[PDB]
């Protein structure tokens, strides 16, 4: 180091601070963007540059060449977290800031572009190993593995205590990314919020809130500018439809969302998702963390665009 501040071009330097920032098509800039974010979010001091770079590069290696659940997604998810963190400065511990960005970069490690359901149906070994939140348990495993590679311990300066804590933040963060788990998490959060029992001092409560953050960051493509949103959806469905094909191969009619023959149903399917998942998520998040409100606003914006698609206004 250490007088070695990462910098971005002006337009990026500015726009990176906003929720709706798109990380762009230049793959080779993404590590730098992450490092920037970490340094800004955490400090230049939180990690050994050399170690961090090495870690980042290995993580990258371990993301596959799938249409959606790839390295770009990783970095995209991290950036939304960075925005949250940066707009809610004083709310988060030092350990949290460290762990959370890392969690996000690692949260879909070695993803195959297939759902937990498919894995179960196919009878994949991972399904036997991990009976719930299959892929998520895997992602965490892979994170630990990489952390354990020579010269990849970015956590090396932390005490034994602090280290166990950070890894525990990360584990919970990653597990939260299991959407099946989101619904109940949010319901509880909403109830607490409303009955005024929510208490950020209660770890158990903090956990929940971090969970929701996770989901939020994870779905952040719904919070982009429309053409980004629109184009990312293509990627999302490319995976769904491939899975659909695989379901059919196992002799199972897939859900229509995964049936490429039922493309026509996409817009309506987006509507449901926005309504059932996305909108509530950002709403409760805004309740708990008011400065995250732009995420809710952008989501609503995108809902409306899907309404327009349906009305053939595009
Ligand atoms: C519709 C739909 N749109 N998206 C979506 C949109 C935007 C982002 Cl940014 C991320 C996701 C999802 S994720 C999901 C889901 O996971 N369903 C679970 C189902 C499948 C397999 C069996 O159970 C269903 C949808
Ligand atoms: Mg995932
Ligand atoms: Zn993800």
Residue-range domains of the chain with CATH: 1-314 (1.10.1300.10)
Determine what percent of the chain falls in helix, strand and coil, rounding each to the nearest 5: 70, 0, 30
Q: How was this structure determined?
A: X-ray
HSE value, Cβ hemisphere, 13 Å, CA-based, for 128: 4
Ligand 1 pocket member 295 (CB < 6 A)? no
Three-state secondary structure call for residue 63: coil
| Structure tokens that stand for 74 in this block | 């990783």
d(CA 287, CA 290): 6
Give Cα separations from 213 to 3, 185, 252, 280 (angstroms).
32, 11, 34, 13
- Tell me the CA–centroid distance for residue 212 and ligand 1, in Å: 16
Kindly report the number of other CB atoms within 10 A of residue 188's CB atom. Answer: 17
259 is in an annotated binding site: no
Is the Cβ–Cβ distance between 35 and 57 less than 8 Å?
A: no
Question: Is the backbone peptide bond immediately before 2 cis, with ω within 30 degrees of 0?
Answer: yes
SS3 47: coil
Q: 39: closest CA among 53, 28, 27? A: 53
Phi-psi region of 253 (alpha: psi -120 to 50; beta: other; left: phi over 0): beta
Residue 190: count of CB within 10 angstroms of its CB: 17
139 is catalytic: no
Question: 221 CB less than 6 Å from ligand 1?
Answer: yes
Q: Is 127 in the pocket of ligand 1 (CB under 6 A)?
A: no
State the catalytic residue, choosing from 20, 39, 69, 124.
69
**Separation between Cα atoms, residue 63 and residue 216, nearest integer Å:** 21
Q: Which ligand is nearest to the CA of 77?
A: 3
69 is in an annotated binding site: yes
């Amino acid at each position: 180091q250490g007088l070695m501040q990462f910098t971005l071009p002006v337009r990026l330097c500015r726009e990176i601070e906003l929720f709706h920032f798109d990380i762009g098509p230049f793959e080779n800039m993404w590590p730098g963007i992450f490092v920037y974010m970490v340094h800004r979010s955490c400090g230049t001091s939180c990690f050994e540059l050399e170690k961090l770079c090495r870690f980042i590069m290995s993580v990258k290696k371990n993301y596959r060449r799938v249409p959606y659940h790839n390295w770009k997604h990783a970095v995209t998810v991290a950036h939304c977290m960075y925005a949250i963190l940066q707009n809610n400065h004083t709310l988060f511990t030092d350990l949290e800031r460290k762990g959370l960005l890392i969690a996000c970069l690692c949260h879909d490690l070695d993803h195959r572009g297939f759902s937990n359901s498919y894995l179960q149906k196919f009878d994949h070994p991972l399904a036997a190993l991990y009976s719930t939140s299959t892929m998520e348990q895997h992602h965490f495993s892979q994170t630990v593995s990489i952390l354990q590679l020579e010269g990849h311990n970015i956590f090396s300066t932390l005490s034994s205590s602090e280290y166990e804590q950070v890894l525990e933040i990360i584990r919970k963060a990653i597990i939260a990314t299991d959407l099946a788990l989101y619904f109940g998490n949010r319901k509880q959060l909403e109830e607490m919020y409303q009955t005024g029992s929510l208490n950020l001092n209660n770890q158990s409560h903090r956990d929940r809130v971090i969970g929701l953050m996770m989901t939020a960051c994870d779905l952040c493509s719904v919070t982009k500018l429309w053409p980004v949103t629109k184009l990312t959806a293509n990627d999302i469905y490319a995976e769904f439809w491939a899975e659909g094909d695989e379901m059919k191969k196992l002799g199972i009619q897939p859900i229509p969302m995964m049936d490429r023959d039922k493309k026509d149903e996409v817009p309506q399917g987006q509507l449901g998702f926005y309504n059932a998942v996305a909108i509530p998520c950002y709403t409760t998040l805004t309740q708990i963390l008011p400065p995250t409100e732009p995420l809710l606003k952008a989501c609503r914006d995108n809902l409306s665009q899907w309404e327009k698609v349906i009305r053939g206004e595009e």
